[PDB]
Amino acid sequence: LPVVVEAHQVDTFDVPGVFYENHPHEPHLSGMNEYNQLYQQSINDPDTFWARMARDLITFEKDFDKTHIGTLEGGDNAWFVGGRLNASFNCVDRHAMRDPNKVAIIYEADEPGHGRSITYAELLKEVSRLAWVMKSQGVRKGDTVAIYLPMIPEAIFALLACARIGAIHSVVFAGFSSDSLRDRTLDARSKFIITTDEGKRGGKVIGTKKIVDEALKQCPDVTNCLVFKRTGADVPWTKGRDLWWHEEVDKYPNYLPAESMDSEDPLFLLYTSGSTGKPKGVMHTTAGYLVGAAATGKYVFDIHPADRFFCGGDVGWITGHTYVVYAPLLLGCTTVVFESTPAYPNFSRYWDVIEKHKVTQFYVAPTALRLLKRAGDHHINHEMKDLRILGSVGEPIAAEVWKWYHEVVGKRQAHIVDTYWQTETGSHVITPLGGITPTKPGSASLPFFGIDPVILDPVTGAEIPGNDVEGILAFRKPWPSMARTVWGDHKRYMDTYLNVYKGFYFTGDGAGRDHEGYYWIRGRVDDVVNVSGHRLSTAEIEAALIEHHCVAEAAVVGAVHAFVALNDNREQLQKELIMQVRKSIGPFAAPKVVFV
């Protein structure tokens, strides 16, 4: 009967009463009335709203002159212009100055019972002397730095050391192949790379140094490779280029000044797969990104300084960037860096970790939840007394999974927050607010502050007013943490995001807005498919399969599949094509089947 079929007879669930009873502090908003008052101001007078929000949450070296200039169609947006600041000062120094012994990072290592806690003062020391290493090797403000690191606290040290000298960190997921690492390092023109000798994940060894070595044969601009000794195994060594992390930091002081950055200086590049297949270096600048990260951390995830925040995503993706690293440290709470998998040593591991460290918010992808639900509820028998927010990112958390998450995991005690956003948006844009917004299973709920969503007719591009409508999901106004360009290719940025429907930002997603105005995300309308938590390009898989000798026409559709048009050993060839995609992208992009 309704146009948004997924919302039909879907009831609204209030925040559980025990959430407020057990909450250690006073909430950030008084209820939905204040959300609405603040939301309306953020849409009608963004210059006033965001100026106050920024000065609440971020410490500027020099105050900004104007909240925002530029327009969506101009592709010239700038936020907090005239301001100066440094991201590592806001993530580290200001908290170490106030409370040096507060724990900033809980490292949970691949083996249970290892790991360690790191204070804000210890973090300031490690960020400083790592920054000294890069400065001493010639890294300068505005240079990019390639990072190929697994989930160890040294990954946070590296992002924040780059920020501290005004270098632009370019994190490459540590499961990518050498070709993928090479492509991103070449496009970023990085002269310096940081990696490990090996990674340990789920009891398995990852030869990171060997992969970097292969990639660097084709990156002649890289002149220094800083290697952290994670396992101590014998790895190949290039005299005159390779340096040991522990040997170099021991040479340098435990404090370094922070470089004064413009609000609009680049902070990082994050390569994503687009529909073309060539990686897009999505570029975020400094002040607006940090304002969005802190604002969503505070109001979406209800983060207070004493909290212990655990995001299960990898630093190689935007979820790890914004919610393992920037948001919790900006706000001065504790963040969990988790090196293992949810299944090692056993399927209880996530809850083992939450119980031991008394985690207050947990943030994961529905792929992991489905894996664990199939494993069985006997793996969950953990008090987890302090767990009050349960986040979900990457796809709509469906009814069966939402119930299991709310009942079996959260014991009907925690608020489930389904956060919709993208690498290009920097931070959450459609989401319930933790402890505030009533939710519907499968819905992302309502827009965050400063986000003005519209539903467009896919063909004519016209706005579709009112409720119970469906179509293209676009935003009508700029927002502080929006991506500012695609590295080296502003025209691709304009054409991809801003010129499709002029005057709007195009998300690439379809959506319905139900009778109550709640949003229901429909998934990509372009050629980007999301498989097992990874944003993959079907064109990139096709281009990999075509790279084989016998393959001519290759087609990939979405669990992604690949039908190739070719050969007298078909059973023996299906392995050679699978390995071809393993060399081009990585293990995590091999097709589920190779059709002929």
Side-chain angles (χ1 to χ4, degrees), residues 2-4 6-10 12-25 27-97 99-275 277 279-373 375-526 528-546 548 550-552 554-556 558-559 561-562 565 568 570 577 580-581 584-591 595-596:
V3 179
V4 181
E6 42 261 66
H8 180 56
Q9 259 156 18
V10 177
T12 301
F13 295 103
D14 285 338
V15 175
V18 298
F19 171 95
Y20 309 110
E21 308 181 2
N22 303 332
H23 199 290
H25 315 97
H28 294 314
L29 297 180
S30 57
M32 277 299 288
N33 283 14
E34 190 180 19
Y35 160 78
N36 280 307
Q37 170 188 51
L38 290 180
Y39 178 78
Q40 284 303 314
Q41 195 203 26
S42 75
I43 297 300
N44 295 329
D45 191 5
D47 290 351
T48 300
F49 177 89
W50 282 117
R52 186 182 63 246
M53 183 91 14
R55 291 162 174 143
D56 284 359
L57 298 177
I58 297 293
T59 308
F60 289 81
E61 293 164 14
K62 175 181 174 259
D63 193 27
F64 52 88
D65 306 322
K66 194 168 176 51
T67 296
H68 171 248
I69 55 174
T71 56
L72 277 184
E73 185 180 338
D76 52 358
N77 293 100
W79 289 80
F80 314 113
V81 293
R84 299 197 78 81
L85 76 172
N86 183 282
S88 75
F89 179 93
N90 277 274
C91 290
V92 191
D93 303 51
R94 65 179 178 167
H95 305 304
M97 283 163 56
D99 199 354
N101 300 333
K102 169 154 202 44
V103 175
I105 301 163
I106 296 179
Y107 164 48
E108 178 69 30
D110 193 51
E111 295 303 323
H114 301 193
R116 69 188 186 272
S117 293
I118 307 168
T119 68
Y120 273 95
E122 293 175 311
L123 176 57
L124 183 53
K125 162 172 162 179
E126 295 305 336
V127 167
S128 286
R129 53 185 196 160
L130 177 56
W132 265 106
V133 176
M134 283 185 293
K135 290 187 71 65
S136 303
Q137 300 305 129
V139 181
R140 296 206 239 204
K141 177 190 178 188
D143 293 347
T144 66
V145 174
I147 298 176
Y148 191 68
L149 286 176
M151 292 296 279
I152 56 186
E154 285 73 18
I156 295 187
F157 300 168
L159 274 66
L160 294 182
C162 291
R164 191 171 195 86
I165 62 177
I168 307 168
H169 63 73
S170 179
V171 179
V172 178
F173 173 61
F176 271 125
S177 73
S178 59
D179 280 4
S180 285
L181 172 60
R182 172 201 64 189
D183 293 342
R184 294 161 173 67
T185 298
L186 267 181
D187 188 74
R189 304 190 313 279
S190 308
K191 288 182 298 204
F192 195 99
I193 188 167
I194 306 173
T195 194
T196 46
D197 51 1
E198 289 177 333
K200 292 300 292 300
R201 185 159 191 271
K204 292 194 182 67
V205 177
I206 304 88
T208 48
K209 180 54 157 67
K210 307 187 85 105
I211 287 169
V212 165
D213 272 6
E214 179 177 358
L216 290 185
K217 299 172 173 176
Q218 297 190 278
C219 302
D221 288 359
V222 173
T223 52
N224 295 276
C225 174
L226 188 71
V227 185
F228 180 79
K229 187 176 282 282
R230 169 63 182 81
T231 68
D234 290 341
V235 293
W237 198 255
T238 297
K239 219 192 221 261
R241 183 199 78 192
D242 294 334
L243 299 163
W244 284 114
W245 184 310
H246 61 281
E247 302 186 334
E248 301 305 313
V249 296
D250 272 352
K251 297 171 174 170
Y252 298 116
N254 292 330
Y255 180 83
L256 180 78
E259 187 70 25
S260 181
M261 308 301 299
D262 198 280
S263 293
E264 287 295 342
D265 278 324
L267 179 62
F268 63 88
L269 311 181
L270 191 39
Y271 284 84
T272 76
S273 296
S275 61
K280 280 186 297 206
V282 180
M283 187 188 86
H284 283 284
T285 61
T286 299
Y289 173 84
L290 299 175
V291 169
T296 54
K298 186 182 177 187
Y299 290 101
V300 176
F301 284 148
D302 183 47
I303 281 178
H304 297 253
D307 279 337
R308 287 78 63 197
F309 187 86
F310 180 11
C311 173
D314 201 272
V315 69
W317 316 119
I318 192 77
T319 303
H321 277 52
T322 304
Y323 297 106
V324 170
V325 177
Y326 281 105
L329 300 173
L330 284 171
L331 298 171
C333 75
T334 302
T335 185
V336 174
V337 174
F338 174 59
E339 193 178 24
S340 198
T341 78
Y344 183 82
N346 58 48
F347 281 116
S348 298
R349 183 69 188 273
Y350 270 162
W351 330 123
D352 285 343
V353 171
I354 283 160
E355 167 65 22
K356 164 158 177 192
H357 301 302
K358 316 303 169 189
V359 161
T360 47
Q361 298 95 344
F362 182 55
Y363 195 24
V364 83
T367 293
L369 297 177
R370 287 189 294 266
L371 159 76
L372 298 185
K373 188 178 171 302
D377 309 332
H378 61 289
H379 297 287
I380 319 181
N381 189 26
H382 300 65
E383 180 177 11
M384 310 187 288
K385 174 178 66 60
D386 304 287
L387 184 62
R388 71 182 192 268
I389 300 295
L390 285 173
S392 185
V393 50
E395 52 178 300
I397 173 163
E400 192 178 57
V401 180
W402 186 97
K403 174 180 187 72
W404 183 86
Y405 204 23
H406 180 69
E407 303 185 1
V408 180
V409 180
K411 313 175 196 12
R412 309 184 221 259
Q413 204 155 264
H415 195 210
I416 290 185
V417 176
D418 183 2
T419 66
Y420 169 81
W421 62 301
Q422 316 173 289
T423 298
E424 295 90 339
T425 72
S427 54
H428 309 141
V429 290
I430 306 186
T431 179
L433 300 195
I436 293 298
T437 313
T439 55
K440 303 187 178 184
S443 173
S445 301
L446 297 177
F448 191 67
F449 300 134
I451 298 307
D452 189 10
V454 300
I455 292 306
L456 307 178
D457 190 294
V459 191
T460 80
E463 285 201 22
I464 305 170
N467 292 326
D468 208 20
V469 303
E470 63 185 351
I472 286 304
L473 177 61
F475 302 149
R476 207 199 326 252
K477 300 182 73 161
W479 66 104
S481 66
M482 63 191 307
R484 297 296 200 274
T485 195
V486 168
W487 183 257
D489 194 346
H490 201 60
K491 179 161 198 290
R492 184 180 183 183
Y493 172 90
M494 299 301 294
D495 288 342
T496 287
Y497 302 115
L498 293 178
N499 289 339
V500 190
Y501 306 100
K502 307 213 200 216
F504 310 88
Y505 168 89
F506 177 55
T507 63
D509 287 314
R513 177 170 63 232
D514 71 7
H515 63 88
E516 279 180 20
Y518 275 51
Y519 284 83
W520 298 77
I521 307 288
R522 256 84 180 275
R524 307 288 306 211
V525 301
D526 58 350
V528 177
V529 305
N530 285 113
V531 284
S532 296
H534 294 143
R535 178 174 160 175
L536 296 194
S537 170
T538 62
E540 191 175 15
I541 311 265
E542 295 169 351
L545 294 166
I546 286 179
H548 192 264
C550 296
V551 189
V556 173
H561 297 262
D568 251 4
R570 303 267 156 100
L577 310 181
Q580 176 62 35
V581 183
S584 308
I585 312 182
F588 65 100
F595 299 80
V596 173

